[model samples]
Target chain A: DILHPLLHKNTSDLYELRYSSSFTGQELFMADHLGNGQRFFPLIAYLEMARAAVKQAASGIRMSHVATDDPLLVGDDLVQVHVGIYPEDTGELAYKIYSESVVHSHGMVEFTSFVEVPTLDLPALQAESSEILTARQCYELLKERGMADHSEFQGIDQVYRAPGHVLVKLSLPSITMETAEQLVFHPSLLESLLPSTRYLITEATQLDGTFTLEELEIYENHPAVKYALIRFSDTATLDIELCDEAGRIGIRMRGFSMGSE
Target chain B: DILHPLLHKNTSDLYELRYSSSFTGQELFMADHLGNGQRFFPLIAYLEMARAAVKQAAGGTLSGIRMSHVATDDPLLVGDDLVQVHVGIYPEDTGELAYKIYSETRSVVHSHGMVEFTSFVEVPTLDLPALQAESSEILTARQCYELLEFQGIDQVYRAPGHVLVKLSLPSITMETAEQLVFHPSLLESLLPSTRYLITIQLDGTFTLEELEIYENHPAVKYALIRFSTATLDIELCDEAGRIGIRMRGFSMGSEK
Candidate 1:
């Protein structure tokens, strides 16, 4: 359904970068942030959630024998993902992703892009704090923050350059951010306290096993919140990516300023 | 509604001034200037339209016109293409007014306050010859427009910007007094009355005529008179007033 809005009924399928997953210690990346200990749900978190959803769906398969799960990297450690959309007969849209990742300790995870992963079923994450904003409101917020507005990186080329993918579920709960933190012990390291802001689970694509937490933070603003967080699940969070050439991805949400309300 | 946009809704109401008459016969003020037989719509047409609307609305009763409507006309035009506007009266706003005009292009032009009427009425007889000659010779639509702009009159148009001319009489009468103070048109039509001699005789009581003439005269431009007993009265003379206009009342202030 989310794909229908972006793809329309055209013969051409949408090609998008899904997500990148790099291995760190047992502590997940979603738990780290800049300050205030709030889960810094940057743009990339949504894509990370979608990748985790597909991984969880085909969990039983051994990654050591599957080359399709590994992406073909062209230059450097920067992994590129190309996404395709297929309408299934079950009245649901299928998201197919092909990506390149570095070798992990487990194995070279491989999977066929042709395989259809079912819609991710994840829980709705409630934000201890929520900020409701229109498109213009967010734009002004970013501008005031001395950061580039969403329009600056709105180009279709910029969207596709970063490897990512997004899935949309019509029935999932919309926007909510988690603030609660918890501590978990790691097997190898000292009792590594990880802040788990629910659903903001950030993973790495470990391209050639050469990934750093800093590198992960730099790719933070890549996955934009095109529309409201329409749906969320333990497996996948459904959100839209706005591509100018494609007009709108999920729904044509209106823009407004905070001044009126 | 008279006012196009009621700024304060609690008190203001919009009332429209509509017209059903055409400029014909003597009313046909201009004809065939750009070409032969083209019925030119003059600025006075709007004034007359307004006058007619007020007259019809008032049903021939005496109407105290405090607000002014200044308007202009397009170049030589046809008869049916006369301009129309709605005049709004703000009972609470005093001299304030709101107006909107329907243009030939079916567009409603909105404006406020005063308008200047031009390109109509060849000189009237009440104006002095020197003033008439100066108005016709020196003034053009451009200059008139500039003058209107200087005074901030709304809805100025470029056309056969004809000047309003009127001949004059020196004596000020009771009937003409209010026009001098309240009507800019009357003042504009006459020669500059600033230099005229003014004599105020308060030796005895005077007639209403004396008071009227005294109020309207150029000499009494700004004056306030009072009596101690509050029973002061002014008696009038004949039109000539040579018999003496007297004010018979106790002198509240030092006799001037």
Candidate 2:
């Protein structure tokens, strides 16, 4: 059953925070989203979704996302769009701190909140200077990823928290999100659920793709297979088995995908 | 088969704040927690837990609590705590503003955020004033949480923007929280079927006495265990479960 469905259509002003943090720590920071508490319906919706996600994860219930349009304070900085993750399976969710710098300063301060890394892979992100990446840096990375070729996230200021990543304008094209897949669960554990096929990963959440092809070596062993060939891509998909097991458990993710008119 | 697990432990807190909201048609508000992002955690543990509870509720997640920790934000006056509504399901499962201060005391330059009568009552909370009610009219994030101490599972703060105090606490005490614990999730929607299993015996959260007196509290008053689990009801069961669960999930938060 659904857990804590939304009660009201909340609204809030749009704001963001900007600060620089590295393995060493603190840097110049500012909060720039000074919303007048106007009728920010869309912002509220996004925040509400985030809040519910957090609650479900915290309550040990499976949920989509934990969004919080939380206006909180850390020290002197008011945290807007505060989203805390309470992942159920791993219970190892992260806290994504996003806000605008209220004071636009050039001088750097120190922030020592360093997270210990256990691997040498050195987590591949979009960039290093996420807090201060210039527009050129962003464009170069996007160009490397062919994003600039498509004019998708172009003409945007660059922040290098994650390299090879692009962040379009804030309100430009309107805060669009791209997902790697509609698995609803993490792809790493997807095999545990299916137990049959090992889905290939040509692209991850970091990439935007038109279609994905899975061999479904596992689905091949299933007895309930109606069509010998179960195929899925950007278009003309085929189904092999069909069963109404979970609530709305079909391979359909609303608004999150591209299934045009 | 753990149907509904818990989050952040049964950690609760109280807080105090000195802040102001500038409707300069912008999100302009000075804060102490981040200390301009150059200080310690403004939300100290106990206080952090308390403030977290209110925001959590406002976001539509109930943390589960016992007393009337929630209160009214009456600027220039102490809030009244005589009567309260438990499990106040906020009218709108979603509200943009946590505190609505519409009326501002001109001479003093303080705001009295008006609470939406029926709507505000539905939100689950137990917040109250951390300082003298009449002292400061400005409500800070910390004070807003401190006031939640008054709201419990069965009690509530009705007046809108009535208490604009931040959620801050001077000290952390077990007895104080025992008097009133805060729930993260306020009210879902009307007729919310968000009840989870409550087995004081198997529940890892409560203290020994807390488990024994679980039957007395409103949140877990009607708790029961079915079949074999019924015999295993008690604090020991909780201990065993926590250990076993942790062992099973090597991760700190049972992320196994």
Candidate 3:
């Protein structure tokens, strides 16, 4: 909800704050990549910059980056700070802070907001299904399940691992309700009925590409073999398995409604 | 699974299409709001524009949304050859589409998308437990502060039923963090999925009458105010009047 203004803003802006070191116990410093710093300032400085970015973001002005000229605000000069907000692949906003002073040019802080990481709820894999699936095989399986069609996703790739878990990256070229529905639920034969779209299938189990009908039987109550993280990008990261079972699904649109009741 | 692109970029790109008559059944026309031509264009034209927007949005790497519904508040008549239909597509904060179609006479011919409609209705008997469940979970100042922290909000103060949220943004001198919180979007972002009412005062304080109305509101579950004094406070109560939460915080000192 707080992300709307930042997400819609077309331009980026910078805000500067005066820094001083004369006050006792008021020290801000940065570290080298070697993890060393001189008189380091606590997280308060970082929090201050982050606060500025978030505040301007409320008015549709996002900070693309942030940083201090020198990590150490102990100097007599005013600290030159900058914050920049950038659009991320996961569809959330990313901001960075850095400095270009004599003290620490390499100092920086960064993070993405409104980011979402999926909660895994898949059943544990058995010994027989422990083999790591290949990306190609996973892609084919997802395609068979009605995902990553050439027309829908800009690019469809996969990350394979053992214990029957595969992470498929589905990048949407654009936003549309139909594509959004397809990305969330790969409703293959039920395109018209959009069966999978209505069911909130949060579980996935990876299967061998050459698995038989009986091998796929393990996912009975689990109609949806795909569990997705639905990352903060235009992409949907899915953990899926092969299954033919059918069930009811609920619609889940990011920023659309409240938590699942 | 095999459905083509939700919206075809080619057809949706209106600027590329010619204003020719031979486009045949592939044509989308609307009445000219200026009463210039009848049989002007069809709804397909509107869809083309929407698609164009979707396509351009893709170029900008923005999310895509679809046309959910369309309704005609006023009628289009035959022999109104010089009919006109003006179309508009409005995207809400959530990227949802709200659209409208205006006739030559400025009458609304069609409309769709999200809406905020106010109405009067008789209250229905409620299940006490369910109503209580619907109420916001009560939280103390410390707990509320922790909740915001858990949600990645680092600068927040808790008052009764309210959180004085300090945003991360750019500011000039003399601009208090409290001034930044006055934006409705900021408040909406802080409290997602919850309906809220904000009472803004130049003095940054709420009047007794306003507080009375908010305290007794049936639908308003949360009320917040960012006082002109650089403080934040809230007063919230559930429908059952049993569950209540409030927060109060004074000025947060300078961190420079």
Candidate 4:
């Protein structure tokens, strides 16, 4: 039931969302992420939750200085989030986020709502079979070796990669696509993009827990877009875009920096 | 599935709970509630929906609420029509909640009311203690279903001035997290006992005002309902023979 927490709209400018991880180790199953014999809410989900909040305000243009101090237990506990969407002095839209009683995260999302959604035919899909990783193979690889993440953030269903670019076929929950906003970049869609880059997240020996997304700026993000192309440099900074070869939706991401906290 | 809908945390002080009858008409006996195309959600069900919302807010436990007052302007509802209850729960102060349920499109207030935590009930010792049943009969869920009956009522008793019945509710179990809706049967339970009133007067519109949901004493419950052409009364008790929910004075208007 908590795949999507119940949310309340307090006002046009403010919103509140409720969540409790049933943590019965199903959809939200965590594989001892914190190694403390307790499951920790993945840092990616906090950002995704922020993305969900951002969808209420407007489409997210960029997420800057993303950070969190404490780890919340993903096991059956109430987590409330309060997001306030207001304009900054510079005339740009920004967000202020925090929770009460059990506060676990804080961040700002700067958005520039889209008037014209971009378009690009995804090359990952058109590439020859030799250029693509089998769908099952991609998921198996993503599961066993890469990130070691749970089901909630596993949106990349298919993958194709080359030297500078990695392409992924996306699979997100149907509810994220069914919205008044029409073309929403669901929290999971954005969260999965982080792990979908670099042909896999780690060296396959140890799962890295030290990584953090420094900044993300998007041109447009649409749930209708079924494929994503990740452009990265040696430092793991990535510029990602979504396109479906047959579908007409596409968007651009201002390459984001990722490294240790 | 129509009993509860996903929610939206609309404000720090308010929550918006939504539902639409996915009434595919499959639960034929259950869905044809109005009998006269009575698919309108039972007014009592609206109160139950509010109770569930408070439970989601208060804590996801099976505690019930005390309905102190209520007023309604019944509206037409159909399968798959969206409606929402704006529950104003004051967790910071008095745990009093003011619920307003209305259509999402029409935005008409179908029902609105005040309810507090079950602890605030202060259930009174009522006139129910003295009233004696003139006749008694117990019916299982299947027997009630036989007549397209108020299947929610399990046992019925006719008294001089009151009607008492022991309710059959879906018991909570490990399978109940999905059944986690707060005593959903509370309001629906008592209303069905109205059938046992002296003589059914079908001449005018039925109305219920001055309503409340108090006392969750019995591990199971007994609903003692007393009514006249002019007013209505309901008393609730524990299976151990103790008065739990006690209050009176409701009005049902007839077109006479």
Candidate 5:
């Protein structure tokens, strides 16, 4: 483990980077995600690697749209993230940079976005929340699954859970999401916070289960609050809303999907 | 897909384009759906066409959207009827592109704005569900057509928390989109679905985080509507339950 993501890459077209999983509570994906038997690397973390690669290329852009056709597991190794920067043909884009990030040799992840923009700002609506659980209880759930729960990754302040609904409030101080002076909403902390909301969904925490991100949006020019409402189903679809400190939704990650492990 | 735009003339920094039924219906793409009787040509449509004209002059998705002095002279119509968007582009801030829009033969104006592209990352898990809704009410096409004069939407399913619907908006023959990525009509088609949520559509500040077109084609969708003091949010998903469009931060100016 490099102790930091992207501490480990190559240059130019096909920006290549390498990563592996360790059960250390310090690394984002190493913190016993699927408990002891296996760890699940998130689609968000995978994409974060892409962001780091294109930091200078993209110069801090917001997600207009992003989608992935696959998932990453802790068992996988020598994983190489390939991000290629291309000039956009679409007249709509001014900065017009399309950075396509794929894994192995295929379209594992794709983002069509552009450069610099600045301040923006919200939360969730009522749902059929089943019961309320504190972050400590959720940590225990992660622990029972056999994960090495890190204090930084044990996300929610409190969770309102139900069959298909998960509403979460963030413990800002408890979770350290502070980032570079230039970034407005950094994916590093979000990748940790968003997936942590899943443990409370319970069924989603099963070792045989995996989440596939079909789409996602993390604002580079918006508020950094981490409140969220996760919506899921029996088959394989999921959605979430990232809200402001005031509990109003500021970002909506819709129609994100999942699959059987 | 057509050889040219729906409407555009003498293109440059200041350009003009057509506004028709295609962008009139799920409209806004959160800007369309405003009117007294005849479908109100959305002020957002002004920026959309201006957005298209920007593409015509140059191209992108719009943000920091605001419209002022946008008085509707006549409600915009569908079919053979034609309205042209005349846009005057001004480069203000580095990232912010200022636009002055005028609808001639069909008049409209204001709008200080900029356009930027945004996208998502990961199947990033650190956390996160799936979907079902019981039908609470159903409005036939007849009912919707009466409510929304635009020709789209096969049916509407009203649920306890959201609205579900079969998508059958006026079919675009690819060429209709022309310089645009996806026809605003695809967005326009979903407008009246909000009627189950309201009355006369009015102008408001809204952000379209993402709107994508899948070659596979979707037949159904769930519109999970959210609201706050001055905010109205809607998330769009299909039968397979995938999120495709997000219209957020839309606040009412004076909804009648």
Candidate 6:
């Protein structure tokens, strides 16, 4: 079949990568971002819920991407990117969707190449959280702290790495100094206690290991939230590998200075 | 329906990078070099010709890309690239050609991000010339010169690195020197008339244009009639572009 348009003798018709501003509207959500216009909406979660509901309603799961009782990664397991393309002889910009599926495999994360292209133009949308943050740890945190520009706080259970830097701001206040020090790092040990703000800090290494209460505290950048713990059941396999502490000078001071100002 | 099975699926299934080859005795033409074991004879060219011929018969001129008639400056023109995927699961191998219409734009010379993926598979071909000494250039050169290979004469046209110095074996007998001063200097010019048994000797540096022309000469050596071009015609508006050809040996050999 010819894709070109049929014409009325005098004029020729054509279909092209056309643009129309009427397509542009508020994008409801984005992934890895704090606001709207994010491509990472809860598309996957909705799909999962729909599947589960359909399975329950049918007393059998419909033929779909999922096969068994094991959790199947869905749309929520994807990342979306949006770019603008302006084709020839067009007045408005056309939105191009570039999306990929991300999954953790073999202890490393992998992103599959783009699988689909759906054009959309939107103005605003209801902001949503990333699928990664939906695991038990972060879910509870969101409930407790509520939403803000950005904030970090540690929970009650965390494995500490050796010589790891501790961010007093992010850790649970109930954590003991001795436990923090011994489990996190020995003060005299070459590594420092404070974790960098740019990284996620977690104490997931050992399940049964316990340390004494008193330990030295090495100051560094306020540790940002690493792994969010949403479920009490999800805390079983926390393995935190302690590494050498990176230095943080002006950054730590400026953060505090701004707060004071 | 799916087109070529070599491109990304879905998008490619709806479109195809169509091409054709003529190999009547064989079941299929344009074998997939990757050895996945299949061939796609693009009917697009035939379809295009039909469209053009029908249009011309119906009193109309060809349109679309042909109207511009710009000699593609982009080396990666889609019309010339190896076939890619337009079938099955759309594997993201940039090597596949998904669909005919999937290729949204045919880039002009100055366009950006045009890609041309080469085939990794070395298609096995019957080298009848290599098999027969009667057709071999080495055998021919043996009859023409006493020490064709030992004389360090390049019987092929390799450019930038080698220059074409044809020494007519008949003329080499009266040459003033056995080894002309292959000065370890850059290639400044090419004097084609003085020698026989073409010596593609190496010197260095010339305008890229000169190098391409010298390398592009036909019948220079390895005289494989595989390529279709003799020389690229370069022109610059209001700019001094030198153009000339030395067709001296046309009458000397029946090869052409």
Question: Which candidate number would show the highest DockQ if scored against the true structure?
Answer: 4
Share of reference contacts found in each model = 0.00, 0.00, 0.00, 0.14, 0.00, 0.00
lDDT tens digits by residue: candidate 2, A208-227: 21212121111111112111
lDDT order, best first, reads 4, 5, 3, 1, 2, 6
Per-residue alpha-carbon lDDT of candidate 3 for residues B143-218, written as tens digits (9 for 90 to 100) = 4444331222223333334333323332232322222112212222333212121212121111111111111112
Q: Write the per-residue lDDT of candidate 5 for residues A1-261, one digit (tens) a residue.
A: 131343232222111122222322235334343434334554455445544434433222334334444444444343333344343433221111122242421212234343432221322233555667777776666666643333444445677776667667665443244333323334345544544544744454433323444444554443566566677632446677676765644445566554443
Model 5 alpha-carbon drift over 4 Å, by segment: A1-10, A13-41, A52-55, A59-81, A87-130, A136-153, A162-164, A172-211, A248-250, B1-256
Off by over 4 Å in 3: A1-261, B1-43, B53-59, B62-64, B72-84, B114-256
Q: Which lDDT tens digits does candidate 4 get at residues A1-261? A: 122332234332112333322233223223333433435555555655566555544343667656555555544544445555554546354554455554455555665666676665554345632456655555556677644433434566766765556677787645533441433445456455655653444422222222345565555454356787776633455566666656455455544444443
Per-residue CA lDDT of model 6 for B131-249, tens digit only, reads 23232133233433443212223343223222232222222312222211111110111212113223343121111111011111112111221111122222111111121111111
TM-score of each: 0.19, 0.18, 0.16, 0.56, 0.34, 0.18
Give the count of colliding residue pairs in each prediction.
50, 112, 68, 11, 49, 69
Q: What C-alpha lDDT values do all the predictions have?
A: 0.24, 0.21, 0.28, 0.50, 0.44, 0.21
Candidate 1: what's its TM-score on chain B? 0.29
Q: How should the candidates be ordered by DockQ, best one leading?
A: 4, 2, 3, 6, 5, 1
List A-chain TM-scores for all predictions: 0.20, 0.19, 0.22, 0.60, 0.55, 0.16
Report lDDT (Cα) of residue B175, candidate 4.
Answer: 38
Q: Between 2 and 4, whose DockQ is larger?
A: 4
TM-score of chain B of 4: 0.61
> What's the C-alpha lDDT at position A94 in model 6?
19
Better of 4 and 5 by lDDT: 4
| Interface CA RMSD, all predictions | 32.0, 13.4, 16.8, 9.4, 18.4, 16.2
Model 3 lDDT per residue over A1-261, tens place = 111211112222112211212212322123113333234333223433343343344311222222333343323443444444444544344544443434322112223332332233333322223434333444344455543222122223333233223333232133345333312223221121111221112224221111101000111111243322222212122222332212111122221111111
Native-to-model Cα distance after best TM-score fit, residue A114 in candidate 5, in Å: 12
Per-residue lDDT of model 2, residues B1-256, tens digit only:
1111111221111111112211211111112222222221111112223332233343333333222112222222111221110111122344322221112324321121111112122222221242224332343434333542122122212222221112123223344333332212221100011111111011111111111111111232111111121111211111112110000100001112
DockQ of each: 0.00, 0.02, 0.01, 0.08, 0.01, 0.01
Q: Report, to 2 decimal places, the DockQ of model 5.
A: 0.01
